[PDB]
């Protein structure tokens, strides 16, 4: 041996939950022997992350029987980070350059010892772990070429250098999922910046609502129901900013401006730390589809904005959805407003839209039982996947706006 | 003159509500100076009827603005049925055939005065006006070609000799509308017989529940309404009888089974006394659609009939219904049923449909909050006018049956 490691090695195997099967010694030694090894395979690696208490990470069980029954004969290893994590958090954050060494002489083992193309493996982590994993890339004698980062950490590591951190060079692509970027970035743990080809900023990218602590159990959970699901990847905008795509102008993808999300990102490299955005529901599967509007407004009286208590319907050739309160800060006459709906169901095909502005809670009355109201009509619409660009219309009596038991419908028409 | 009218004529005008213009004089003398009449024009001729107190009809304005916007140039008579009403109501029956043989001298005047085609002549009238009318029309030398008798009178005309009363051969085309056939034959008022070539029971013909004494006065209601509203006539139904047609196994029309109401019968004529049947609105004008269904039910478990609060909604291209309970006495597995579905509203052509058994004062907990229920799919439709064969489908979920809170929804499909 060179460098006697520290960190006790596992290969895994699909009958091991949350135990060590087999040991892999460091060391030129017998390695294909007593753990399973195939060349003709896939090696996915994992790095586990930081730990306040001594533990190891319990959702390991259900993650390695994913990877396991999405790829057959796969080599999954883990490594020890308790052998050097009980200390303090930044001591830990100095002992991550030695442990992306102990990786770095992990991946140049084989290079020479199996002489692996290395062009078939995977290297992920979360929280420090990331961190030495992008160390080690940085490293690399021969360039690894896929990356799929978790939710890093924060302020240990504040505009540091480019071998220090992940960057865009320490791999053929690189992909990071930035779940928890609320707060201060020299107090609160992640990063606010675009550190690898493409970043994710999923349910606004400050905190999921779903409420443990929720900011990393979160990054493997969409990661694991993204893999499981493989025939519907969830599809990324690219946008510029968080409130740009709230209001939905980041959702044509005519050109490459929208890609998958998870295990598989359509292999599309050479990026300039684009901004990258979803959606996310809670505790069940995270499979949100997307659309978005065009309304249009009509009215020589000339009102102006008062509430955002508006709800909205959807009945469609598949499914239906009951209702989905939302919030439009502007509202006035003779102007074209937008707003985002999230689906947790497939409508697929569209026939008729719904729409129900009671504001039971916001001035529902608004002196007698009635507001003063526009006439609305000519709304467009614009599906989150593919393209959809179709006319819509509306009829003569329900197009006024009204408080209260006003069940507005819609209905298409091309000609 | 030959014999002296007691019955005093008025010749009417657009410009009169309810008074006498020009009184016409009995015996042969002037009668176009006074009073205006056209050779090329319209008479339309109607007789006052049975009155309790001394009073002209209340609705003859209306009536007479009605035909005289609908028809232009035309000839409207009425008679004076006070100079013989205020008797007995038997003994007002026994004065019909006496004002029966002064209308008798009226229309052979004309016959040889102004030598009259007689094929552009309208005979109608209400209560015993009507009877004498059908005595007239039995009496005439030369047949008259149309009448439109209202609502009849009851117990005076029992199994009556067919010139005492109205009769096919009485005309070339006679329509009769039975409004109340509710009660005894012997006490109540109102034949419940096809007395003409067509007869008419509307709302079942028991009686309109819009609730005065609300019977006679409907009659003329829907006569005006169907003559206003001359581009949509009210489609009548031939059928058996009332719960036939209230099943509704009635509304094909591939042959001649449909005509339209009130004015224009499409002058469809040598009938075999058949029942002809509508439904209707109360106090807005009377133009309700008809549909029937072909629901189907399947289910091993063979569960049995429990109650029959049900409620159905319906969503189209032109027009929206919010909700029509419904009543229907049997309800069990893999059995096919129908119910009639009358609508205020065009719905035109359709896209899905929607319904909502919440059942809340009949049985809505049914011990769980849910009822055993049976799986609901392939639901056929028949528009109540031209013909709609199409075929729509269920999806998966919602094919259940639910106790409360239950939004089943349906979808066209043709493949």
Same mark, same amino acid.
């Given at each position: 041996? *060179?460098?006697?490691?520290? =960190?006790?090695?596992?290969?895994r195997?699909?009958?091991?939950?949350?135990?060590?099967?087999?040991?892999?010694?460091?060391?030129?030694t017998?390695?294909?022997?007593?753990?399973?090894?195939?060349? =003709?395979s896939?090696?996915?690696?994992?790095?586990?992350?930081?730990?306040?208490?001594?533990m190891?990470?319990?959702?390991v069980?259900?993650?390695?029987?994913?990877?396991?029954?999405?790829?057959?004969?796969?080599?999954?290893?883990?490594?020890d980070?308790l052998s050097?994590?009980?200390?303090?958090?930044?001591?830990?954050?100095?002992?991550?350059?030695?442990?992306?060494?102990?990786?770095?002489?992990?991946?140049n083992?084989?290079?020479?010892? *199996?002489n692996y193309?290395?062009?078939?493996?995977?290297?992920?982590?979360?929280?420090?772990?990331?961190?030495?994993?992008?160390?080690?890339?940085?490293?690399?004698? +021969?360039?690894?070429?896929?990356?799929?980062?978790?939710?890093?950490?924060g302020?240990?590591?504040?505009?540091?250098?480019?071998?220090?951190? @992940?960057?865009?060079?320490?791999?053929? *692509?690189?992909?990071? @999922?930035h779940?928890?970027?609320?707060?201060?970035?020299?107090?609160?743990?992640?990063?606010?910046?675009?550190?690898?080809?493409?970043?994710?900023?999923?349910?606004?990218?400050?905190?999921?609502?779903?409420?443990?602590?929720?900011?990393?159990?979160?990054?493997?959970?969409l990661?694991?129901?993204?893999?499981?699901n493989?025939? $519907?990847?969830?599809?990324?905008?690219?946008?510029?900013? +968080?409130?740009?795509?709230?209001?939905?102008?980041?959702?044509?993808?005519?050109?490459?401006?929208? $890609?998958?999300?998870?295990?598989?990102?359509?292999?599309?490299?050479?990026?300039?730390?684009?901004?990258?955005?979803?959606?996310?529901? =809670?505790q069940?599967?995270?499979?949100?589809?997307?659309?978005?509007?065009?309304?249009?407004?009509?009215?020589?009286?000339?009102?102006?904005?008062?509430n955002?208590?508006?709800?909205?319907?959807?009945?469609?050739?598949?499914?239906?959805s009951?209702?989905?309160?939302?919030?439009l800060?502007?509202?006035?006459?003779? +102007?074209?407003?937008?707003?985002?709906?999230?689906?947790?169901?497939?409508?697929?095909?569209?026939?008729?839209? +719904?729409?129900?502005?009671? =504001?039971?809670?916001?001035?529902?009355?608004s002196?007698?039982?009635?507001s003063?109201?526009?006439?609305?009509?000519?709304?467009?619409? /614009?599906?989150?996947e593919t393209?959809?660009?179709?006319?819509?219309?509306?009829?003569?009596?329900?197009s006024? @706006?009204?408080?209260? /038991?006003?069940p507005?419908?819609?209905?298409?028409?091309?000609?």
């Amino acid at each position: 041996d *060179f460098r006697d490691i520290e =960190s006790k090695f596992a290969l895994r195997t699909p009958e091991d939950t949350a135990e060590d099967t087999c040991h892999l010694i460091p060391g030129v030694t017998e390695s294909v022997a007593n753990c399973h090894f195939n060349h =003709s395979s896939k090696t996915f690696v994992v790095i586990h992350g930081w730990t306040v208490t001594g533990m190891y990470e319990s959702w390991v069980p259900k993650l390695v029987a994913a990877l396991y029954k999405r790829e057959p004969d796969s080599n999954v290893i883990v490594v020890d980070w308790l052998s050097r994590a009980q200390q303090h958090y930044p001591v830990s954050a100095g002992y991550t350059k030695l442990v992306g060494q102990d990786v770095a002489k992990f991946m140049n083992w084989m290079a020479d010892e *199996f002489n692996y193309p290395l062009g078939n493996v995977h290297l992920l982590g979360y929280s420090l772990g990331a961190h030495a994993a992008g160390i080690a890339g940085s490293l690399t004698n +021969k360039k690894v070429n896929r990356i799929t980062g978790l939710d890093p950490a924060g302020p240990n590591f504040e505009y540091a250098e480019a071998p220090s951190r @992940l960057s865009p060079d320490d791999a053929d *692509f690189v992909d990071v @999922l930035h779940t928890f970027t609320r707060g201060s970035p020299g107090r609160s743990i992640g990063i606010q910046k675009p550190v690898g080809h493409v970043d994710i900023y999923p349910n606004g990218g400050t905190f999921q609502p779903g409420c443990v602590k929720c900011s990393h159990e979160r990054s493997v959970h969409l990661f694991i129901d993204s893999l499981l699901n493989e025939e $519907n990847p969830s599809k990324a905008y690219r946008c510029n900013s +968080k409130e740009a795509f709230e209001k939905g102008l980041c959702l044509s993808c005519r050109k490459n401006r929208c $890609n998958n999300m998870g295990y598989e990102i359509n292999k599309v490299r050479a990026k300039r730390s684009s901004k990258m955005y979803l959606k996310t529901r =809670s505790q069940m599967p995270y499979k949100v589809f997307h659309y978005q509007v065009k309304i249009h407004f009509s009215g020589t009286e000339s009102n102006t904005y008062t509430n955002q208590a508006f709800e909205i319907s959807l009945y469609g050739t598949v499914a239906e959805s009951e209702n989905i309160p939302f919030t439009l800060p502007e509202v006035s006459t003779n +102007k074209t407003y937008s707003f985002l709906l999230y689906t947790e169901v497939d409508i697929g095909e569209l026939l008729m839209l +719904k729409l129900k502005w009671i =504001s039971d809670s916001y001035f529902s009355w608004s002196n007698w039982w009635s507001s003063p109201g526009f006439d609305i009509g000519k709304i467009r619409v /614009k599906a989150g996947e593919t393209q959809k660009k179709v006319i819509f219309c509306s009829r003569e009596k329900m197009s006024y @706006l009204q408080k209260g /038991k006003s069940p507005v419908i819609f209905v298409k028409c091309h000609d």
